[PDB]
């Protein structure tokens, strides 16, 4: 992240929780956080290399 | 033209014959071979005239800038870029240039620069077309660190020699002495040293 | 603003560059991949990503010399050209000074390389990063190739989407593979349990695993098939 | 206002104004320096400040006068990054001029051309004002003592004694003072050194502000030659006056 | 701000000056710590690099980067533009060494790197530089330290700092100045670099640190450059922990 | 003036067999009425299966011989390691030989 | 196009079990004229290598700077570019080759006679031949000029073939070059009384001699003959 303010920074963690809820968990994960970051954003998560 | 430079204990003495020969017709009787490209540092010019003034001129452009930026160049420093110019036209020129010169840190030092790129330190040197007959003579009275007088008497009686023996080789003996005490021009006439 | 984002000649306020940041994003949307060495081998074990099943897979290694190789994690166009320029410069080294480069020392005329583009109006920057291995006198070596073009040296290291935890995995057996020195199997062996815990939406197969290794008696040598049979 | 305008130096205003170049005379006082040039009957002098701010710095290195040639001295206000790029240029022009007309490049002649090629980067969009203020003091081979300061937008007019920095108002006021109440455009002395004295002496005066030879550094351009005076050098001229 | 000024390198704002060149500097401050000791028988150089992870292998990556054999560079801020220009250097050197057939003097050295940084403020297809380089070594008039600006500034330097904690290493290089009033020999002042950089690194704790010294001395390197290393640096380690505890 | 091409002398000898093939050759390697070394390599591997020799004057061959081995290198990374036959190799060295023929190379080759 | 203008005369050199020896005078003729007495035509590069040069003087210079910058290449980066990757000769071989290949396309070749001499980083032995015209090959006994016919054999009796480089030792192979240095002062007219000789040894490395003097002087067969006259 770069240039999330506070209240950004809450919307990721607390959005990485309902996402780990979905797939099965109960509990967060490092990678849950960044799968976060991807709603702010528009960006993919996963997409195969042939622009990025 | 003989030409030569020899250190001494205060410094250096650059002695050149000043004839200027085109064939059998001597160009001009006089005028120096002994081109300053800094204050304290001199050089002496043998073989085609043209080329060996065309080739000084470049170099005082190069230490023009030396001096400004980047300090005092040495004896060295100007050699190696007569060095560069003479090895760049190996194939093009043919130019037999001493490098001599008076330093803070070195006193007088020789550098000699034959008629290719090359680069040889000497604390003597002789070059041209007329040193080649007075190399059996210099040799005997070369010796370490000699007072003033005893360095001009040498080289007066060495380049009478070239002259006596070779026709390119003429006209007055110029002597360029570079020491702490500043640069002083000495002139000599025929009369004197022919005997001598 | 990002107003600073239209140029790769235009530092921002707090002297950084959005262009160099961006191409950081695309290693994250870029494949997978582990790099990881002992001090008499070195591997590259990546994800080769399909982009459907009627798709034969690619190839994510690419290599250099008989000595080095490289792996890749983002811009498959960029990976492309900065791997013409790197051959060139084995093939250089090779013809005019009968030498095998130092990995580090052919990192540093990539790093340049990458930085090129970044002075310059015009010139796309780079958003890929390199994994790059070799075994020269010096042993194995290791380097990370940013976006910047930074290079760095490490004992082990992962990059692409999900390699956190392939990180987190090494950093616990760091000192274990080191001092495995002799046996390539087992050095192997560890950058599949690392690329196992990257996994999400994907299963591990034969055509997935590809290892790339070089090493004390081993040429660079990329391993595919039923050779990674033994170690699916 | 702006609407493009100072974003370029290939675009005038309404007034034909350019204002980019504008700029570069706000640009040189950024150094905070003040200089002095003035000139007597066989030399000049020039004299800037000398700021060591920080003891973290080697208070000898620190200056702005540089000798670009055997004959000719400058003094730079303004930026050091501009110092050394516009010392470049006169350096070299001034080598070239001397090999390819084989006889020495005069104080006129170096601030013509400088100029000239000033007003090429003012012309084109490539380039942009080098943003000093050169001062080139030369005891000439043929017009003796002179002065031509060279403004950054590239003009050029010589000078009896001239000031340059930010408080150049005060050290004009004392120039006019001085050459008006003599009816003679130069000093009267005919000792270079009281000559440097007395421009300390002015220098002190029109600033208001007493100095030490940590404070000041001089340049003094004679004919045939050029120094640049020591701090202990400087030092024995300021005893000189403080007991006359 | 915007109106050129911060969008172009050339063009000038009514300040007289450009706020790019500003952010460069800017860069700089985000990057660690770095010094150079001048004394009166060598020059030091210090570098705090930063240890991310402990994936990362000892002394194996720096900052110091040597030019000819007697001239030391580190350079703070971004690290892959700060290699670029000391690669620029050599090439420039390289050069000096053809031509003039002897080393560079470290006053010359200086002069050329501040017009390749200066270029890059000409020109609106350029990026200027975004790092200081602290550099010197000894040659014949002696040892002298210079330190380089990305603002294309630079003076002589008793003492150069720069990076994030240079607060405090300005403040103890002063101190050396006062203490012993000739710099100290160069053997201690590689000693007080570790000291230096360890007050330093309570600027930027948060991470570890790994102290690479090197220096360049008239007679204790024999008038080369080499790395500081072995029971050299053994000691500066031990003589700095002793003195932050 | 300068010959920039000496000899250094030599004889190799080519057999195709119907499922071998021999390069063979002398060690003896001269400048004038001196043997230079008691023992010189002259045909050296290139891979896929070629050998290649090219003597005569040996600096021209070397450098012949040193071009082609680059080509090989080339020839596996940008073909994705495809195996370089004899046919292919034989008119490759063409293109070598009249990229040096007006800087002609004066060696007789067989590979 | 480069013609002999200021030349030296021969490079000697063999192998022995650890080490090589590499030695040569120093002369630098311009015709047949001695213009210059004692210059130094030996270059160390690093320590594991000397590479030495006579044919033109003035290339000789030229190669000079390149094998400085040879070195201040290597010194670029790497805290293992000294000892590991310390100039193996093999390296620098290589490099004067490439450039004498190139030179020589364009007409104008750098004019010498070279022989490169060292051991290895990996300890092994490393003497081979490269010159103006590009030709390469590895022998054991290698002189240059007039000496790669004339004072060649000496060092041949010594070393036969690839299998005698063990079975010369240090002292052997020492005074087979001093040997050698007589035959070249005595009937080749470029001489000089100076020679210097340079050992290269692994366990030892790099030792410089400088100035060393020619003795076994043999003219008691010119007091033996009137001659014809």
Same mark, same amino acid.
């Given at each position: 992240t770069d240039e999330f303010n506070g209240a950004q920074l809450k919307a990721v963690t607390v959005e990485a929780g309902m996402i780990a809820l979905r797939n099965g968990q109960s509990s967060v994960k490092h990678e849950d956080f960044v799968e976060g970051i991807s709603e702010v954003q528009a960006r993919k998560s996963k997409s195969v290399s042939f622009y990025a | 033209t003989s030409i030569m430079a020899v250190t001494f204990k205060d410094g250096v003495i650059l002695g050149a014959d000043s004839r200027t020969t085109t064939g059998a017709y001597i160009a001009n009787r006089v005028t120096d071979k002994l081109t300053?490209?800094?204050?304290?540092?001199?050089?002496?010019?043998?073989?085609?005239?043209?080329?060996?003034?065309?080739?000084?001129?470049?170099?005082?452009?190069?230490?023009?800038?030396?001096?400004?930026?980047?300090?005092?160049?040495?004896?060295?420093?100007?050699?190696?870029?007569?060095?560069?110019?003479?090895?760049?036209?190996?194939?093009?020129?043919?130019?037999?240039?001493?490098?001599?010169?008076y330093d803070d840190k070195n006193k007088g030092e020789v550098y000699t620069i034959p008629l290719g790129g090359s680069v040889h330190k000497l604390p003597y040197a002789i070059a041209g077309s007329?040193?080649?007959?007075?190399?059996?003579?210099?040799?005997?009275?070369?010796?370490?660190?000699?007072?003033?007088?005893?360095?001009?008497?040498?080289?007066?009686?060495?380049?009478?020699?070239?002259?006596?023996?070779?026709?390119?080789?003429?006209?007055?003996?110029?002597?360029?002495?570079?020491?702490?005490?500043?640069?002083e021009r000495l002139i000599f006439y025929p009369d004197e040293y022919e005997q001598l | 603003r990002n107003n600073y984002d239209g140029d790769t000649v235009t530092f921002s306020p707090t002297g950084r560059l959005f262009q160099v940041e961006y191409a950081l994003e695309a290693i994250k949307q870029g494949s997978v991949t582990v790099g990881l060495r002992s001090n008499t081998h070195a591997v590259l074990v990546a994800l080769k990503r399909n982009a459907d099943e009627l798709s034969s897979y690619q190839k994510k290694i690419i290599k250099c010399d008989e000595h080095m190789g490289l792996s890749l994690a983002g811009l498959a166009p960029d990976a492309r050209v900065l791997s013409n320029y790197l051959r060139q410069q084995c093939n250089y080294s090779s013809l005019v000074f009968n030498r095998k480069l130092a990995v580090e020392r052919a990192g540093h005329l990539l790093c340049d390389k990458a930085q090129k583009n970044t002075q310059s109006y015009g010139g796309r920057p780079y958003g890929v990063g390199?994994?790059?291995?070799?075994?020269?006198?010096?042993?194995?070596?290791?380097?990370?190739?940013?976006?910047?073009?930074?290079v760095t040296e490490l004992y082990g290291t992962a990059i692409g989407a999900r390699s956190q935890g392939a990180k987190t995995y090494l950093e616990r057996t760091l000192d274990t593979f080191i001092k495995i020195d002799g046996n390539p199997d087992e050095l192997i062996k560890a950058g599949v349990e690392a690329i196992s815990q990257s996994l999400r939406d994907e299963s591990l197969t034969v055509d997935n695993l590809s290892i790339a290794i070089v090493g004390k008696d081993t040429p660079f040598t990329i391993y595919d098939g039923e050779a990674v049979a033994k170690y699916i | 206002?702006? %609407?493009?305008?100072?974003?370029? =130096?290939?675009?005038?205003?309404?007034? !034909?104004?350019?204002?980019? +170049?504008?700029?570069?005379? /706000? %640009?040189?006082?950024?150094?905070? =320096?003040?200089?002095?040039?003035?000139? !007597?009957?066989?030399?000049? +002098?020039?004299?800037?400040? /000398?700021?060591?701010?920080?003891?973290?710095?080697?208070?000898?290195?620190?200056?702005?006068?540089?000798?670009?040639?055997?004959?000719?001295?400058?003094?730079?206000?303004?930026?050091?990054?501009?110092?050394?790029?516009?010392?470049?240029?006169?350096?070299?022009?001034?080598?070239?001029?001397?090999?390819?007309?084989?006889?020495?490049?005069?104080?006129?002649?170096?601030?013509?051309?400088?100029?000239?090629?000033?007003?090429?980067?003012?012309q084109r969009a490539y380039m942009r004002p080098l943003g000093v203020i050169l001062t080139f003091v030369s005891v000439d081979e043929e017009l003796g003592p002179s002065i031509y300061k060279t403004d950054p937008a590239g003009y050029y007019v010589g000078y009896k004694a001239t000031a340059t920095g930010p408080k150049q108002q005060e050290i004009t006021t004392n120039l006019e003072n001085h050459f008006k109440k003599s009816k003679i455009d130069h000093i009267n002395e005919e000792s270079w050194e009281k000559v440097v004295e007395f421009a300390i002496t002015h220098m002190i005066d029109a600033l208001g502000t007493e100095f030490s030879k940590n404070d000041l550094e001089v340049g003094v351009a004679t004919k045939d030659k050029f120094f640049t005076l020591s701090a202990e050098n400087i030092e024995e001229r300021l005893v000189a006056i403080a007991e006359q | 701000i915007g109106t050129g000024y911060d969008l172009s390198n050339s063009v000038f704002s009514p300040d007289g000056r450009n706020f790019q060149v500003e952010y460069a500097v800017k860069a700089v401050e985000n990057g660690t710590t770095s010094i150079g000791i001048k004394c009166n028988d060598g020059v030091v150089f210090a570098v705090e690099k930063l240890i991310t992870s402990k994936l990362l292998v000892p002394q194996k990556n720096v900052k110091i980067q040597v030019v000819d054999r007697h001239i030391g560079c580190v350079y703070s801020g971004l690290i892959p533009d700060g290699r670029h220009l000391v690669n620029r250097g050599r090439e420039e050197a390289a050069s000096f060494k053809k031509l003039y057939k002897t080393p560079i003097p470290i006053p010359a050295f200086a002069d050329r790197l501040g017009q390749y940084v200066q270029a890059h403020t000409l020109y609106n297809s350029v990026r200027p530089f975004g790092v200081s380089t602290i550099f010197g070594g000894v040659d014949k008039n002696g040892a002298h330290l210079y330190m380089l600006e990305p603002s294309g500034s630079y003076w002589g330097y008793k003492g150069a700092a720069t990076g994030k904690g240079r607060q405090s290493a300005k403040a103890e290089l002063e101190k050396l100045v006062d203490h012993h009033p000739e710099g100290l020999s160069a053997r201690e002042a590689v000693k007080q670099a570790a000291k230096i950089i360890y007050l330093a690194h309570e600027d930027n704790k948060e991470k570890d640190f790994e102290l690479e010294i090197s220096w360049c001395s008239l007679s204790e390197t024999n008038g080369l450059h080499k790395f500081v290393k072995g029971d050299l640096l053994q000691e500066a380690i031990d003589f700095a922990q002793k003195e932050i505890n | 003036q300068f010959n920039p091409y000496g000899d250094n002398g030599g004889t190799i000898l080519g057999i195709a067999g119907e499922d071998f093939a021999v390069l063979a050759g002398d060690t003896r390697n001269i400048t004038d009425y001196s043997i230079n070394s008691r023992y010189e390599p002259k045909v050296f591997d290139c891979g896929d299966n070629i050998v290649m020799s090219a003597n005569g004057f040996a600096a021209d061959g070397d450098a012949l011989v040193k071009r082609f081995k680059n080509s090989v290198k080339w020839y596996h990374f940008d073909h994705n390691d495809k195996k370089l036959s004899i046919n292919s190799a034989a008119r490759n060295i063409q293109h070598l030989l009249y990229g040096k023929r007006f800087f002609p190379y004066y060696v007789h080759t067989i590979i | 196009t480069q013609q002999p203008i200021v030349t030296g005369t021969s490079v000697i050199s063999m192998k022995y079990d650890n080490g090589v020896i590499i030695a040569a005078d120093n002369l630098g003729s311009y015709g047949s004229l001695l213009r210059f007495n004692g210059v130094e035509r030996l270059i160390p590069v690093?320590?594991?290598?000397?590479?030495?040069?006579?044919?033109?003087?003035?290339?000789?210079?030229?190669?000079?700077?390149?094998?400085?910058?040879?070195?201040?290449?290597?010194?670029?980066?790497?805290?293992?570019?000294?000892?590991?990757?310390?100039?193996?000769?093999?390296?620098?071989?290589?490099?004067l080759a490439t450039v004498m290949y190139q030179r020589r396309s364009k007409m104008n070749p750098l004019w010498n006679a070279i022989i490169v001499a060292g051991v290895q980083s990996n300890g092994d032995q490393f003497l081979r031949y490269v010159n103006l015209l590009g030709v390469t090959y590895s022998s054991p006994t290698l002189a240059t000029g007039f000496g790669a016919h004339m004072a060649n054999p000496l060092l041949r009796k010594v070393v036969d073939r690839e299998s005698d480089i063990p079975k010369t030792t240090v002292q052997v192979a020492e005074e087979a070059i001093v040997n050698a240095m007589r035959v070249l002062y005595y009937r080749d007219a470029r001489s000089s009384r100076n020679f210097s000789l340079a050992i290269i040894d692994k366990n030892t490395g790099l030792t410089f001699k400088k100035n060393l003097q020619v003795e076994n002087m043999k003219w008691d067969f010119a007091k033996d003959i009137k001659g014809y006259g």
């Open positions: - | 300053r490209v800094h204050d304290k540092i001199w050089c002496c010019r043998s073989g085609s005239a043209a080329d060996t003034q065309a080739i000084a001129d470049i170099v005082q452009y190069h230490l023009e800038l030396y001096t400004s930026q980047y300090g005092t160049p040495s004896t060295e420093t100007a050699a190696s870029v007569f060095k560069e110019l003479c090895y760049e036209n190996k194939d093009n020129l043919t130019a037999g240039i001493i490098v001599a010169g007329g040193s080649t007959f007075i190399y059996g003579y210099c040799d005997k009275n070369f010796r370490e660190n000699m007072s003033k007088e005893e360095t001009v008497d040498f080289i007066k009686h060495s380049l009478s020699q070239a002259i006596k023996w070779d026709g390119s080789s003429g006209g007055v003996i110029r002597m360029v002495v570079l020491t702490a005490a500043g640069v | 390199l994994l790059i291995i070799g075994y020269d006198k010096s042993g194995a070596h290791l380097l990370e190739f940013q976006p910047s073009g930074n | 206002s702006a %609407a493009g305008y100072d974003r370029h =130096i290939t675009i005038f205003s309404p007034e !034909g104004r350019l204002y980019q +170049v504008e700029y570069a005379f /706000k %640009a040189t006082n950024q150094t905070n =320096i003040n200089s002095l040039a003035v000139r !007597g009957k066989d030399c000049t +002098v020039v004299i800037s400040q /000398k700021k060591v701010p920080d003891k973290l710095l080697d208070p000898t290195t620190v200056s702005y006068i540089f000798c670009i040639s055997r004959t000719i001295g400058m003094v730079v206000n303004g930026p050091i990054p501009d110092a050394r790029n516009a010392a470049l240029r006169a350096k070299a022009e001034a080598a070239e001029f001397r090999y390819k007309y084989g006889y020495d490049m005069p104080c006129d002649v170096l601030a013509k051309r400088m100029a000239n090629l000033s007003q090429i980067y003012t | - | - | 690093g320590d594991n290598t000397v590479v030495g040069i006579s044919g033109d003087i003035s290339d000789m210079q030229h190669i000079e700077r390149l094998l400085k910058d040879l070195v201040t290449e290597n010194a670029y980066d790497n805290p293992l570019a000294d000892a590991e990757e310390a100039l193996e000769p093999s390296y620098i071989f290589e490099y």
